[PDB]
Amino acid sequence: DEKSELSRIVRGVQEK
Amino acid sequence: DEKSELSRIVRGVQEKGPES
Amino acid sequence: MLSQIAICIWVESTAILQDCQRALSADRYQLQVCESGEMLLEYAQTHRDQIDCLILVAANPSFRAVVQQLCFEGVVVPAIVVGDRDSEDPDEPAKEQLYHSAELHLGIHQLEQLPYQVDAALAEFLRLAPVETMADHIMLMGANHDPELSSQQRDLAQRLQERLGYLGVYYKRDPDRFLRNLPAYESQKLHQAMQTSYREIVLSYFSPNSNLNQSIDNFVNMAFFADVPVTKVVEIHMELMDEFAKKLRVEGRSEDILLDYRLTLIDVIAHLCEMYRRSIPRET
Amino acid sequence: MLSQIAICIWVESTAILQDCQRALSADRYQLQVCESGEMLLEYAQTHRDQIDCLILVAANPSFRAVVQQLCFEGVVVPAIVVGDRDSEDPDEPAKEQLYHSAELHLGIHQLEQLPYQVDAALAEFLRLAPVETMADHIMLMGANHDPELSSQQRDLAQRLQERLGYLGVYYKRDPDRFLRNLPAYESQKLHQAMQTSYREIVLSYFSPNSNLNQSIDNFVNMAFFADVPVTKVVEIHMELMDEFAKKLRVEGRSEDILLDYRLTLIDVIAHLCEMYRRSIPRET
Ligand SMILES: O=C(S)Nc1ccc(-c2c3ccc(=O)cc-3oc3cc(O)ccc23)c(C(=O)O)c1
Ligand SMILES: O=C(S)Nc1ccc(-c2c3ccc(=O)cc-3oc3cc(O)ccc23)c(C(=O)O)c1
């Protein structure tokens, strides 16, 4: 959940 | 230290993977 | 085997000019300097097909005006915006799009490796052409009418790839077997097959049974030949991490272990990255 | 547009073949089944020019013998070894390769990925041709070290390249400005430029509403067009972590935030991976 929030950081940035 | 050590293991396979 | 790059730079600073001149001192770069807005507008309107890249300083006077007139005239070329606006912050890389959506932002102290950034601007324009611009779009919705000269950005884009491009052999992947093309059912089916393969990696990570090269290369082959976006791989990771965050929060263990599996995600993406990099047909 | 791949499968098990026929249910794959070692060896001679890819199950009796003999006849084609059945008495593993270096290894339940793995098996062969076998490319004819002076593998590689490959256009990066080609001074100024750029990323990585993403782009641009391997990026990350490590011991807390900086590495490599993925064209 917490890292799921932190992983989504890297997800949305390279979309971009 | 430890972080350098565990980042080095990631390099290792790139050196000797399925490629040259 | 490299075509010349005609660069028009709008700079009114004796400092930045020299920084660009030293960085682009190579014979490949044809430097044209305009030290005023009027001069830029004058040169651009009569050398529209002779500008491959624009180097614009955002802090220039009447910057919005000049770019807007450039934009309405259809002079939409690859561009690098240097610094920020003069209303009224100091000098740092720009924040919002000032010219068009394929532009590049550089600070005044990031001009040393400008040749690589010129390559990036050119390449990004080619990828996004015809490019959305920040003026002629006009705007707040105060449009009027014509024109639609969409050929201009396309004629330039094709012309540039006929000059800044080369031909190489590539493995004819099956686009019909790409992730974004498979029907909704088969799409999530391959998604689970990859989820299973990635779980095989996370467990075999830190063992090592194992042959971690094989387990990872197995996953990377699917991500590559199905043209699976990097965002999906990260998505698979956090999905699995979400499951493991639950496990530890029940067996009374710490979620501190999840930090060490960031290495796993680094490892796989690095492998995927080299797969694409290796496949690039190089002629040297 | 897509050429037909001719598959030669050597399998003894009923369950293994049943999955292979199911996975390659598409009419694109010519399946030729051999339910014994002697059937394969005989089909190998009669149809040596009619084999695109091999699928050799290790669990098949006298495996190494069939493989040893297969290299003698000159039969060197893309392969996919399935499952694990290491011989106990040859006493010469190794296991760096069973057939040839560009061979693929799969699991007995990882066969629903075969179409993508067949692609990988073919592409890997083309990239590493000619390859080395643990049966002929070391001995005997004729030191050193193969009975194919005119490159029989390349006569096949060219044959597979024209059918399984296409011709696209790439942005020609300057090879003279690649990191490994630049003059020693030029090489380490760019390296310092990337170290500086990366530090800027890290220091502002947990700073919201910043030029972080613009900082990433400008680093990745240098990384992509100087054709630096991902290892160097990983190396750059370390050199800064070492710096921060010592910095934290005195005049600071412990080195736990370094684990939080693993996100930064994932973030940057992901960008670089996408940029390579985006730089792949279509056939047109
Ligand atoms: O401040 C303004 S105004 N626009 C803006 C618009 C978008 C971005 C940006 C992102 C902003 C929010 C977000 O959640 C993810 C982002 O990924 C990016 C990736 C890029 O490659 C470039 C810019 C961004 C950024 C940035 O942070 O540099 C700035
Ligand atoms: O612990 C140290 S120190 N170095 C190291 C260096 C390389 C490897 C290694 C791999 C490490 C990470 C990875 O993702 C894939 C790997 O495939 C390998 C294949 C090999 O044949 C040999 C070593 C490795 C390994 C390993 O087995 O975990 C360890």
Side-chain angles (χ1 to χ4, degrees):
Chain A
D1 302 329
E2 300 166 5
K3 190 185 169 184
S4 297
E5 179 182 0
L6 281 174
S7 293
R8 263 182 289 158
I9 304 309
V10 184
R11 178 200 165 86
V13 56
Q14 55 159 357
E15 289 205 297
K16 311 195 175 183
Chain B
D1 299 324
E2 48 162 350
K3 181 55 182 151
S4 171
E5 164 261 335
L6 282 172
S7 283
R8 276 199 254 111
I9 194 185
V10 179
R11 275 182 56 207
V13 52
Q14 297 297 334
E15 316 293 80
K16 304 308 140 183
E19 71 281 321
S20 54
Chain C
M1 176 178 73
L2 295 168
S3 176
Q4 299 287 133
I5 298 175
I7 303 182
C8 177
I9 167 180
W10 181 24
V11 54
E12 301 179 10
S13 172
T14 58
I16 304 187
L17 175 59
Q18 294 164 341
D19 278 327
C20 299
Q21 280 176 332
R22 288 187 296 259
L24 306 174
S25 64
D27 315 83
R28 189 184 188 185
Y29 305 104
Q30 295 296 330
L31 256 52
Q32 173 70 17
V33 183
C34 307
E35 306 203 71
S36 74
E38 321 280 54
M39 238 180 297
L40 177 64
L41 294 174
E42 180 61 25
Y43 178 85
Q45 287 170 185
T46 189
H47 296 285
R48 185 184 56 85
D49 298 325
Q50 302 171 22
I51 303 182
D52 297 325
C53 185
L54 267 175
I55 302 185
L56 300 171
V57 182
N60 289 340
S62 309
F63 183 84
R64 164 187 282 177
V66 172
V67 171
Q68 194 173 59
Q69 182 174 321
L70 283 184
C71 202
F72 274 87
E73 283 294 310
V75 185
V76 184
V77 300
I80 307 171
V81 175
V82 177
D84 215 340
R85 212 131 151 185
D86 199 26
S87 176
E88 203 178 345
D89 46 23
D91 201 312
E92 277 299 278
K95 291 178 291 183
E96 77 154 359
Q97 323 259 48
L98 303 179
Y99 187 11
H100 61 76
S101 54
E103 75 184 13
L104 257 70
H105 296 148
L106 292 184
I108 48 174
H109 303 131
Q110 297 174 318
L111 303 178
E112 191 188 10
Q113 313 302 321
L114 194 53
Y116 299 98
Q117 304 296 340
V118 171
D119 288 321
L122 292 158
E124 184 73 359
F125 183 81
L126 299 187
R127 187 178 69 95
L128 296 186
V131 174
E132 164 184 357
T133 80
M134 319 292 302
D136 180 43
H137 259 243
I138 180 59
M139 238 199 116
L140 169 73
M141 203 93 178
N144 212 5
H145 62 273
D146 278 346
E148 71 281 5
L149 282 204
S150 180
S151 60
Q152 291 187 273
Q153 293 194 35
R154 291 214 183 97
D155 285 332
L156 178 57
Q158 289 289 332
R159 191 176 68 86
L160 288 175
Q161 78 169 9
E162 293 185 5
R163 291 175 52 230
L164 307 177
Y166 76 102
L167 240 53
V169 192
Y170 206 91
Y171 184 83
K172 195 181 295 184
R173 290 183 298 174
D174 198 333
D176 266 19
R177 292 196 281 107
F178 285 176
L179 183 67
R180 68 177 181 265
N181 295 336
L182 298 173
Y185 183 88
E186 304 175 28
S187 176
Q188 65 182 359
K189 172 186 171 301
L190 178 62
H191 184 255
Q192 289 176 350
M194 284 182 55
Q195 278 182 295
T196 299
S197 185
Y198 193 83
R199 178 194 290 161
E200 193 78 47
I201 298 172
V202 173
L203 303 192
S204 64
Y205 219 78
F206 309 119
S207 278
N209 251 85
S210 67
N211 199 350
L212 188 49
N213 183 36
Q214 169 178 331
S215 62
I216 293 183
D217 196 35
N218 175 81
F219 177 83
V220 176
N221 287 335
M222 282 186 296
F224 175 85
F225 288 97
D227 194 39
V228 178
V230 193
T231 178
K232 301 303 180 184
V233 184
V234 183
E235 187 183 15
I236 291 182
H237 184 79
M238 49 178 293
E239 280 185 45
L240 191 58
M241 288 304 102
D242 189 40
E243 178 183 337
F244 293 177
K246 290 182 183 181
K247 309 294 184 178
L248 304 173
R249 206 208 74 192
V250 170
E251 304 307 311
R253 301 182 69 182
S254 65
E255 300 177 7
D256 283 26
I257 317 177
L258 263 62
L259 286 311
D260 293 328
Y261 279 120
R262 291 180 179 174
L263 291 169
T264 308
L265 189 54
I266 293 169
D267 212 342
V268 177
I269 299 182
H271 277 91
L272 185 59
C273 190
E274 278 297 326
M275 260 287 277
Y276 285 106
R277 180 175 172 267
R278 280 193 290 97
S279 58
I280 297 300
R282 291 192 290 266
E283 319 285 303
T284 189
Chain D
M1 294 300 293
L2 303 180
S3 182
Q4 291 194 359
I5 305 99
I7 314 289
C8 185
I9 306 179
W10 182 28
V11 57
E12 307 284 355
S13 178
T14 307
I16 299 183
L17 172 64
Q18 193 170 112
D19 296 339
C20 293
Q21 293 179 330
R22 184 178 303 125
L24 312 183
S25 62
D27 298 30
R28 183 190 177 188
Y29 307 99
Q30 292 190 6
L31 271 68
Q32 192 71 35
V33 190
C34 301
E35 302 200 32
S36 70
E38 299 183 340
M39 275 174 61
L40 183 70
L41 290 178
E42 184 177 344
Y43 183 87
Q45 201 281 335
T46 61
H47 277 49
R48 203 189 67 82
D49 295 328
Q50 283 201 33
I51 298 180
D52 284 332
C53 184
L54 272 178
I55 305 184
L56 306 180
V57 179
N60 298 12
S62 298
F63 181 85
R64 293 193 188 262
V66 175
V67 175
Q68 175 72 36
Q69 172 75 357
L70 204 58
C71 302
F72 169 75
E73 303 191 44
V75 193
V76 187
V77 298
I80 303 179
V81 187
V82 182
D84 184 34
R85 176 85 172 187
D86 53 87
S87 41
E88 325 85 23
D89 61 356
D91 292 340
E92 249 51 55
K95 196 173 288 300
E96 285 191 354
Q97 65 217 21
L98 293 175
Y99 188 4
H100 57 91
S101 62
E103 76 188 53
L104 264 63
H105 307 137
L106 290 186
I108 57 176
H109 282 63
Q110 299 170 330
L111 295 177
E112 67 164 275
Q113 319 162 2
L114 273 176
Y116 298 101
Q117 303 299 337
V118 165
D119 288 327
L122 293 168
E124 187 64 38
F125 191 90
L126 294 177
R127 193 192 60 91
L128 279 185
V131 290
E132 304 177 354
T133 61
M134 202 75 68
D136 200 347
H137 196 287
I138 316 175
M139 183 66 75
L140 194 130
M141 198 276 180
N144 48 281
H145 238 356
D146 43 28
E148 307 105 4
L149 298 97
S150 296
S151 304
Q152 281 273 299
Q153 298 204 34
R154 189 49 178 177
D155 290 24
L156 174 59
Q158 295 171 197
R159 188 155 69 94
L160 291 172
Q161 188 167 158
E162 303 173 10
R163 57 150 64 182
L164 302 168
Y166 66 100
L167 200 48
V169 49
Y170 312 86
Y171 184 88
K172 49 182 182 187
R173 308 172 287 175
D174 196 334
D176 286 320
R177 277 191 294 117
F178 287 172
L179 185 66
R180 66 184 182 277
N181 286 336
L182 285 167
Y185 173 73
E186 296 288 87
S187 187
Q188 59 194 70
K189 294 308 292 179
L190 174 59
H191 180 67
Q192 283 172 350
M194 295 186 65
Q195 285 179 341
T196 302
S197 181
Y198 196 85
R199 192 194 324 270
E200 170 182 351
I201 295 175
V202 171
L203 293 181
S204 63
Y205 191 76
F206 290 110
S207 291
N209 306 327
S210 170
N211 302 332
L212 172 62
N213 312 140
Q214 295 293 279
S215 296
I216 290 180
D217 294 338
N218 299 340
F219 177 84
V220 170
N221 289 330
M222 287 188 295
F224 178 78
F225 290 97
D227 199 35
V228 304
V230 201
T231 64
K232 277 296 181 180
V233 177
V234 179
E235 282 187 9
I236 290 176
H237 182 83
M238 300 189 212
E239 301 166 353
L240 180 55
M241 290 305 103
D242 270 331
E243 173 183 346
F244 282 171
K246 305 170 186 178
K247 161 197 169 187
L248 282 178
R249 302 275 61 80
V250 201
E251 191 242 3
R253 297 298 188 179
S254 64
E255 43 184 286
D256 294 31
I257 308 186
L258 304 192
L259 281 71
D260 271 331
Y261 279 142
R262 299 182 174 179
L263 286 174
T264 308
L265 189 52
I266 305 172
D267 206 340
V268 167
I269 302 177
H271 281 73
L272 183 61
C273 186
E274 263 300 322
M275 197 161 179
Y276 275 99
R277 177 181 169 266
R278 283 160 22 174
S279 66
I280 300 176
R282 59 181 59 190
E283 186 169 17
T284 73

